[PDB]
Design an enzyme around this catalytic site. Structure first.
Site, PDB file in Angstrom:
ATOM      1  N   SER C  71       0.823  -1.202   0.000  1.00 55.14           N
ATOM      2  CA  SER C  71       0.000   0.000   0.000  1.00 55.14           C
ATOM      3  C   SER C  71       0.863   1.261   0.000  1.00 55.14           C
ATOM      4  O   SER C  71       0.349   2.352   0.215  1.00 55.14           O
ATOM      5  CB  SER C  71      -0.945   0.002   1.178  1.00 55.14           C
ATOM      6  OG  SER C  71      -2.066  -0.825   0.916  1.00 55.14           O
ATOM      7  N   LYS C 211      16.479   0.820  -3.383  1.00 51.32           N
ATOM      8  CA  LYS C 211      17.449   1.736  -2.824  1.00 51.32           C
ATOM      9  C   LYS C 211      16.833   2.507  -1.649  1.00 51.32           C
ATOM     10  O   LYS C 211      15.611   2.533  -1.496  1.00 51.32           O
ATOM     11  CB  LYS C 211      17.872   2.690  -3.937  1.00 51.32           C
ATOM     12  CG  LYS C 211      16.856   3.774  -4.255  1.00 51.32           C
ATOM     13  CD  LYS C 211      17.478   5.158  -4.332  1.00 51.32           C
ATOM     14  CE  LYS C 211      17.426   5.759  -5.714  1.00 51.32           C
ATOM     15  NZ  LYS C 211      16.035   6.116  -6.090  1.00 51.32           N
ATOM     16  N   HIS C 303      22.949   4.910 -10.127  1.00 55.26           N
ATOM     17  CA  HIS C 303      22.493   4.766 -11.498  1.00 55.26           C
ATOM     18  C   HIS C 303      23.585   5.136 -12.519  1.00 55.26           C
ATOM     19  O   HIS C 303      23.906   4.339 -13.402  1.00 55.26           O
ATOM     20  CB  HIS C 303      21.142   5.457 -11.626  1.00 55.26           C
ATOM     21  CG  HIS C 303      20.686   5.464 -13.014  1.00 55.26           C
ATOM     22  ND1 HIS C 303      20.654   4.293 -13.740  1.00 55.26           N
ATOM     23  CD2 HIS C 303      20.287   6.444 -13.836  1.00 55.26           C
ATOM     24  CE1 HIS C 303      20.247   4.565 -14.972  1.00 55.26           C
ATOM     25  NE2 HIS C 303      20.028   5.863 -15.060  1.00 55.26           N
ATOM     26  N   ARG C 515      19.556  25.724 -16.836  1.00 55.17           N
ATOM     27  CA  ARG C 515      20.493  24.625 -16.990  1.00 55.17           C
ATOM     28  C   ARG C 515      21.206  24.269 -15.690  1.00 55.17           C
ATOM     29  O   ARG C 515      21.809  23.204 -15.608  1.00 55.17           O
ATOM     30  CB  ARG C 515      21.557  24.983 -18.034  1.00 55.17           C
ATOM     31  CG  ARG C 515      21.093  24.826 -19.474  1.00 55.17           C
ATOM     32  CD  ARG C 515      22.201  25.134 -20.459  1.00 55.17           C
ATOM     33  NE  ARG C 515      23.320  24.214 -20.319  1.00 55.17           N
ATOM     34  CZ  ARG C 515      23.303  22.928 -20.648  1.00 55.17           C
ATOM     35  NH1 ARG C 515      22.251  22.401 -21.254  1.00 55.17           N
ATOM     36  NH2 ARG C 515      24.332  22.159 -20.327  1.00 55.17           N
TER      37      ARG C 515
END
Ligand SMILES: O=P(O)(O)OC[C@H]1O[C@@H](O)[C@H](O)[C@@H](O)[C@@H]1O
Lengths: 532, 527, 532
Positions: C71, C211, C303, C515
């Site tokens: 949940s 993670k 990653h 940026r």
């Protein structure tokens, strides 16, 4: 609302009759006219001394104008009446001497001047209170066109007048006008050179020669070679009577003085360019003379090509005469010889009325004549400005209206307006009067797609022919074809003319007073033009 | 029937925009892009279309007793009525908070005294008053809008015509702070009957004061009404000037080909008023001239003036182009801006800005600005765009002035710069300045000539009209508004931080002398 | 020609409007669309039964998937919708049992499945005709995460389904998905070991853990030690949701299957390598959770380092999973700890719009926070392939675009082309869509110095996350970080993270939607990258 459209038409008429009624009432009150109506509408919406306008150099020295072939049709009907208009306009020096030189004796010079010259003088009251005074400046001289002793006799008649000149400088300037058939131009120029050049103490010599200047590359170059040991290109003026100064300014100034116009004057924006010369008259019993020339040599290779050069030339280095002629020559050298595929010819038959008999009904026209009285053709200018742009020359006798114009059609803007817009145009008309206007699309006052085509107008002074003579008198050779220019012009046309004389293109018959052969208007539609 | 095509070239428009943006084989990119998309007294002449007289129309003017509603909106609807641009049986509701015992007196005192007394129109006042009712309500009570709905629905079923239901125009003549609340209240309480009818909402400025505050207001409204429904009105933009801008350029090769950096030297958009701001400091002092007319009004004219060619004249194509060009404008800098603030007139008849109890002492607020904008794309790079707006200056003048590069050769001093002027105030004009020959000589004999390029509804009225017709072309779109705020917000902050300060200028003058110097230093030439 | 450039621009637009008009005309004729336009341009230039694609071994035995924290946001918004996509794609065995295990009671399982799960199911018509059928494979189970008797109760729920299995083999395979905070991973794995391992008769056990895997070397190794007495490295799958199979093939196959690409994949030819992970969203009111993690631990240490390993590894002995992971580990051991000199941090402030409030405006962010929301840094790989080659990792929240790519820039060939050439690039983009392309310079058709930059493209299937779960189901651990790999990764970053928590590098403020800090783009230019 088809019911309201009919009611609007009637309402516009009755509203125009209401306006006119008011203008009528006020004109019955004051009762002075053409001027008065002008102001009233906008509102709640001669025999005086010639004023001399000649320059200091022109009055500084004797001027003599010698008109050869002075009893010929060109001279008496065109040259002499032009000189009179210049006289009246105050554009000849006060003391000017005019000599009519002809091959044919005359018992009574005074009767010659009245009965042969003054008859063709404009009868406009403002002029013709000056006719007698002008006749006092004209003398008749009778001699041969090939005999040197005649030109010496002439020289001594002229010296007598130069030497009486009651002003500063000595000698005298001499303008020789050769209103003659080309076959005697060489002998006269030589006779002049050998016998009647201006006095050494001073004065210039200029020579105006009339068309035709050859009939092809070969005969034209010959006549140039025949003249050039006597008169260089600063003295020789080959006249095209139709090239008006006003039109030349319309072509040059509108474009080169304005960024808006110079920026669009190219292949990126122009769809087609058409130069049109139309007349209602026929060959008028001179059919036999015309039959040796044809419409192409008559007006297209000389007059329209001169308009084309000015229209298509690159920007000149200055507005000096020889810089302008340098550009005319430059642009003509980019033009390919016209091909028979790119030409449609016509020969006129009797008008509906009979008032213009058919070309082949003139007894001086030889049976079997294939002489074109009408021609439309496309020319290709191969340079960065013009490559792929159709240039159509069109000229016609015995067509629907007397009309001379330049029509430039710009490419359409398809998006976003589509059918709510239409190709822009620039129109420079010389005949039957002066107009220059652009057609653009604009909003209508009261949806974006709701558009209107509107003409924006951008625009007794000397006529075309008079301005050219005046220019000759001032030394301005801008609007006269130069020897190199002539040759290049002839090379554009000579192969087509040869293919025509060899019988490879036949004229299409057309009734005098119509637009010309149907194939010609289709030809124009097939080479870039779109109607309305 | 028709909704195929509206989708189809709706698709071609996306392919259009994609190809012009990547600038590819045009063909191979189109394929690729498709694969991956899976005293006279004139009487009323009806000028309304078929669709407008086929269904009930109701116009609800919120804040009906406000100064905006009573002095501008009602009078403008009156002028449309007389001009025959409202349907015959139009229903107008005046919505306000205050209880009104005597509704017909209200119409006399509050509304009719602001209608033009002009002789031509005077006759229709009472007849127009028939089409107006008052309604008393709050701008958040759900029941007040249920009642409104029912009052509205009565009039819609009393309409005898081909279509069922009713079109509804909601005019928010209100303070911006209540817009979201009213818009939600309309959404849950009074949308048109499902049987048929469109809903459209007109909102009034300010549309925020900066990027952040403006985006907040767009975000509050965007759950209730989309960009086809929502009309952010600019009182000052007129149909006639927008048409002169778009048609004269885009319909014509001659103008389209010179509308670029290779031909144009500078462009000025000017908004000048003789009046000042006396007793308007409440509105004005926090807003100032830049927000008041330049970020909104002048920037829309700019975008229309500078946009690339749209594929069609459909409202949203034009508006797509406005957005694309505004997105090529760099944020204005403090170095490209001259500010002014007016003091008392020389003759002393007219008070200065600061001389006003509705203005705080020592105010920094500009009543005047000239600024240079730079549009960085192929068509416009290097071309100066000057916006100028000023209160209390020498004359009332609104115009675009486009100055073209001179042709120095071969006419030199016998020519000067071509110009195009589009003027709106004090009267409409559009003309180009060119040089033509004069007859009488030398080629160099020339003249400067002005070629002219050829009761109506005024600017504001023409925008209400367009809202009624569903034409959003002249209304700032949500994305368009965002981009406009991003042009001006960093400068506006640089101003509130006093990096740049307003120069005084007596009322009735041209403004700060430094302004005219700025303009000449940005490419303009006045001969 | 500045005049022609302007005329070319307009001509390209009008030519694009012409093309589109034709495509419009034909589409109005046939009237079928996105497919049709495709072919016409090149020319003259769903609710069907799930087709099962599962292997023989997968249908041979019962499968049960147990999602702990069922949940929670991860489970309901990401895990369950992924399982549904696999279901629809036909990549789950036909009889699969899905158990949602949560700590919190539920009165109505059916309302739970509709209102808490199915809301996040893709509504794409092709799917959502299968939603009800998928819900029939899902059961809710309520128990503690530390209590063994709960896991036995669970084991007996699972056995009931395993034992009903209507196919060849006995027992059942069990995939445990720990969509939980790390603090309970040890107790759950132990609970599982003590109470709910598969039946002895047969079946495997696999565990996916989410993670973070520690926060530094020390805490990470501890968690590894805590798990390893229950699950070895063939059973433990540490998931990085962002690592797409398609990108991994783009990295591995393009390079190792082609001589052209393997030969240039080294220091002799590559100038710089950049791995970029950019998002437009902010911390979105989860600022307080993020404040304990930061962008470096969030996406860079896990990653981007995984993408780096695959990008930089030596050729593996085979394409077997554990051979690939052996190389990932090998290459990471060549990387020096990142230095604070080689790192630039940022923390975002409010967007221009306000739509992204500033990081420090989130009330769950404690005053004084120096948590980086942006980071660029350079890593040095010291081996024969890579020594001296800059590797830049860059990750940012609240920047200008959502974008994930690899950019390899090769050294320039200065001679002979000079300015007529430009550094070659290979680009492997995963977001916002897949592209892989090389930019090279080539001739232009029509002088040697006349060159063009051209992109050569080299290139409902499961998304990144779905492919990883599927891989877990098939026993392929290639794209999951291995215990040794994790430790090495942590050792690269831990000193930098310590220097940041010790306050020796402060984030530079940047407006959300830009940026990032200007210093970062300068940092990239100062470490090997050259623009255009
Ligand atoms: O009177 P028109 O031509 O319809 O336009 C009204 C004009 O009014 C002016 O005040 C505005 O600044 C212009 O932008 C606007 O166009």
């Amino acid at each position: 609302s088809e019911e309201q459209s009919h009611a609007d038409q009637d309402a516009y008429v009755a509203d125009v009759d209401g306006i006119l009624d008011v203008l009528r009432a006020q004109v019955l009150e004051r009762k002075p006219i053409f001027q008065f109506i002008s102001k009233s509408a906008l509102s709640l919406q001669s025999c005086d001394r010639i004023n001399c306008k000649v320059k200091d150099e022109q009055k500084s020295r004797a001027l003599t104008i010698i008109v050869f072939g002075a009893s010929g049709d060109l001279a008496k009907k065109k040259t002499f009446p032009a000189l009179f208009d210049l006289y009246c306009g105050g554009l000849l020096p006060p003391e000017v001497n005019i000599i009519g030189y002809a091959r044919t004796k005359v018992d009574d010079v005074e009767k010659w001047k009245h009965e042969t010259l003054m008859k063709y003088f404009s009868n406009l009251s403002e002029r013709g209170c000056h006719a007698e005074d002008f006749l006092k400046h004209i003398s008749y001289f009778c001699g041969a066109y090939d005999s040197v002793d005649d030109f010496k006799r002439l020289d001594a008649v002229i010296r007598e007048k130069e030497n009486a000149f009651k002003g500063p400088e000595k000698g005298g300037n001499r303008l020789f006008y050769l209103a003659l058939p080309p076959s005697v131009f060489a002998s006269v120029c030589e006779s002049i050179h050998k016998g009647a050049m201006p006095q050494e103490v001073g004065g210039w010599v200029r020579v105006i020669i009339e068309k035709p200047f050859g009939r092809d590359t070969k005969s034209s170059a010959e006549l140039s070679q025949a003249l050039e040991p006597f008169f260089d290109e600063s003295q020789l003026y080959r006249i095209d009577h139709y090239l008006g100064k006003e039109m030349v300014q319309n072509i040059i100034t509108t474009r080169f003085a304005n960024r808006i116009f110079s920026a669009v004057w190219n292949a990126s924006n122009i769809a087609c360019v058409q130069i049109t010369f139309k007349e209602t008259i026929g060959t008028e019993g001179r059919g036999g003379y015309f039959d040796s020339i044809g419409i192409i040599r008559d007006v297209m290779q000389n007059h329209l090509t001169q308009i084309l050069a000015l229209l298509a030339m690159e920007k000149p280095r200055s507005l000096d005469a020889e810089c302008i002629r340098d550009e005319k020559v430059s642009v003509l050298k980019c033009i390919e010889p016209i091909t028979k595929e790119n030409c449609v010819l016509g020969q006129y038959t009797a008008s509906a009325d009979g008032s213009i008999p058919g070309y082949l009904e003139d007894v001086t026209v030889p049976e079997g004549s294939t002489c074109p009285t009408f021609a439309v053709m496309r020319l290709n200018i191969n340079n960065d400005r013009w490559a792929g742009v159709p240039f159509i020359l069109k000229a016609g006798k015995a067509v629907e209206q007397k009309y001379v114009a330049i029509r430039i059609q710009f490419r359409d803007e398809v998006h976003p307006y589509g059918e709510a817009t239409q190709r822009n145009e620039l129109v420079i008309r010389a005949q039957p009067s002066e107009a220059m206007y652009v057609k653009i699309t604009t909003k209508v006052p009261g949806d974006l797609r709701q558009t209107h085509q509107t003409e924006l107008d951008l625009t007794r002074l000397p006529d075309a022919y008079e301005s050219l003579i005046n220019d000759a008198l001032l030394g301005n050779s801008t609007n006269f074809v130069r020897k190199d220019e002539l040759d290049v012009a002839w090379r554009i046309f000579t192969p087509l003319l040869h293919q025509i004389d060899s019988g490879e293109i036949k004229p299409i018959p057309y009734q005098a007073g119509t637009r010309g052969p149907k194939e010609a208007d289709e030809f124009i539609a097939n080479n870039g033009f779109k109607h309305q």
